[PDB]
């Protein structure tokens, strides 16, 4: 019986209020800035490179993905901003690689395509990291991997950051071998030249497809005679399927996936989906771009969960943290979101909640908007560190799928307790207004303003107020620049910057993909009582 009437979250914001008008205007500008920058990244190398690419009869990398996935299906692209201003004088749109999750023949798959128009498809250090992140996502969720291979090899000027280390280019083949041993299909489509390590990708794949003339495979670098589809297809045997052109190869790939003999099974209970009771675009006015102002995280929840229905857990205890049960697109989810400074009660409340979700095998969603931990002599005497550690330790051991969304600041140990990047959430997204760093820019400035005020007060040479901002202004600039969402996203610290109006859709797609793998039992360490 599911006919019980229940209460719903959310309230109607005051659209006429000046605060709402200002917050909407600021957030809208950030979203518009995000959109137009992606449009530029969409063009890859440029008109001359794109014209040359098409002149060879090859499809553009994004057109390949459009033809590969099922007609009209959504495509969840990841790390669109990788390499954004990362290198001083080189522009590398998207890192030279396009990764995302789409549906092929009704199966969710991870698609990894080299962008040959960007530096001829050479592998920059960020390119390796982006690919490795995609492989990690595919393995953790048991998603088949499809490699649209068109690459020019490693970027020699930066070889030391590509070749040698464990998380360097070599790890790519290690991941392929491991996934194959776990029956996670590895499919490679050679739609261009692959040289040196590149030739290993088709060789390490379970099934392989090569285009008639464009594709070339050789350990040591005419190219067609040395490699080519005909040599590998008919003589070397490296090729499993032979394709006339890019369209033919993509058609063959869809057939290969259809023969995987895989059917998705759900471990969680399902209920009919319902839209939230409030518009999503109201999040612009509610949240704004000023991190100093505070908002009720429940308002964010009310606009993303099915029917804006939410069962809060321990509502009046540790009120700075909000925990409860909801459903997104029918999936059950346990939501943990910051509503103020973390306290001992908040950490205990979170630790209790995480155990509940793990026991019932309920996916967890974290909404990070942190401002730090409570600071005080009494709090330390009562083991706030001991309480904060309880949550870091429960979150780490949880085996249910975890997704993190940074809707505000992310500073210090508060990041760890709320399932930061270091704690292997299945996905991590950030809003365009977010800031992340070891501590807030102001705190670092003020802390230094104590150390050197002390330095010269204790030493005895006076240190004046103008000497203070010759200390504080460079620090604040550095933390503002390095905490910017684009700085964080240019390197692969998150899986993308998302428009707040798209939060519900992105979460729905992400949780759906994460459910391809069975949920394991959670084993906890010692809870330091």
């Amino acid at each position: 019986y599911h006919g019980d009437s229940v209460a719903s979250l959310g309230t109607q914001p005051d659209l006429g209020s000046a605060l709402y008008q200002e917050n909407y205007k600021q957030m809208k500008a950030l979203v518009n800035q995000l959109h137009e920058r992606v449009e530029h990244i969409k063009l890859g190398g440029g008109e001359k490179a794109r014209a040359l690419h098409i002149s060879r009869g090859k499809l553009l990398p994004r057109e390949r993905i459009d033809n590969l996935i099922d007609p009209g299906s959504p495509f969840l692209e990841l790390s669109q901003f990788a390499g954004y201003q990362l290198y001083d004088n080189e522009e590398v749109p998207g890192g030279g690689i396009i990764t995302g999750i789409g549906r092929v023949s009704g199966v969710e798959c991870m698609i990894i395509a080299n962008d040959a128009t960007v530096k001829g498809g050479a592998y920059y250090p960020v390119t390796v990291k982006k690919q490795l992140r995609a492989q990690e996502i595919a393995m953790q969720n048991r998603l088949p991997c499809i490699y649209l291979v068109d690459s020019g090899g490693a970027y020699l000027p930066r070889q030391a950051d590509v070749f040698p280390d464990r998380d360097h280019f070599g790890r790519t083949f290690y991941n392929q071998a491991i996934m194959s041993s776990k029956n996670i299909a590895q499919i490679a489509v050679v739609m261009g030249s692959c040289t040196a390590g590149g030739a290993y990708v088709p060789a390490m794949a379970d099934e392989n497809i090569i285009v008639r003339k464009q594709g070339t495979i050789f350990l040591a670098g005419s190219a067609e005679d040395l490699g080519g589809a005909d040599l590998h297809c008919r003589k070397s045997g490296v090729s499993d399927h032979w394709a006339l052109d890019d369209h033919h190869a993509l058609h063959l790939t869809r057939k290969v996936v259809r023969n995987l003999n895989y059917q998705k099974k759900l471990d969680v209970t399902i209920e009919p989906s319902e839209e939230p009771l409030f518009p999503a675009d109201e999040l612009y006015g509610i949240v704004g771009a000023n991190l100093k102002r505070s908002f009720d995280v429940r308002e964010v929840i009310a606009r993303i969960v099915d029917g804006s229905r939410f069962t809060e857990f321990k509502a009046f205890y540790g009120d700075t943290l909000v925990t409860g049960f909801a459903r997104i697109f029918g999936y059950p989810v346990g939501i943990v979101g910051n509503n103020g400074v973390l306290f001992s009660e908040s950490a205990k409340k979170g630790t209790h909640f995480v155990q509940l979700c793990c026991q019932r095998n309920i996916p967890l969603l974290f909404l990070q908007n942190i401002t730090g931990f409570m600071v005080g002599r009494e709090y330390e005497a009562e083991g706030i560190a001991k309480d904060g550690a309880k949550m870091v330790a429960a979150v780490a051991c949880a085996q249910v799928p975890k997704i993190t969304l940074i809707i505000g600041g992310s500073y210090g140990a508060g990041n760890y307790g709320m399932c930061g990047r270091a704690y292997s959430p299945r996905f991590l997204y950030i809003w365009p207004n977010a800031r992340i760093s070891v501590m807030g820019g102001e705190q670092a400035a003020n802390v230094l303003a104590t150390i050197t005020k002390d330095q010269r007060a204790r030493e005895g040479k006076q240190f004046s107020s103008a000497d203070e901002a010759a200390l504080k202004e460079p620090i604040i600039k550095k933390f503002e620049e390095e905490g910017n969402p684009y700085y964080s996203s240019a390197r692969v610290w998150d899986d993308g910057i998302i428009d707040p109006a798209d939060t519900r859709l992105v979460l729905g797609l992400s949780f759906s993909a994460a459910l391809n793998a069975p949920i394991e039992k959670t084993d906890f360490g010692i809870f330091r009582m």
């Binding site: 959504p74 099974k265 399902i270 029918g330």
Partner: protein
Amino acid sequence: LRQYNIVGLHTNIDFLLNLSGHPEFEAGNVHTDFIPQHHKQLLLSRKAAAKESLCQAALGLILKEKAMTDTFTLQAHDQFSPFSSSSGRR
């Protein structure tokens, strides 16, 4: 006649539509040589389609793909996944 649809073989229906719309037939000026006499107008060649018709055809193809997607979704355990939508969203 327009509501009558026949696919699989050629029929005289379009000829009957041209004949029943001929000015001399509308006037009742009929005789046994009517078809031979007005053969040029009654037999009509094909004319290039309008862009609106092409748009409708593309819409029909897209909707057929959407129907196929729904048919596949019917048999899946993950009935309400957003991936089953035909939004084509990015």
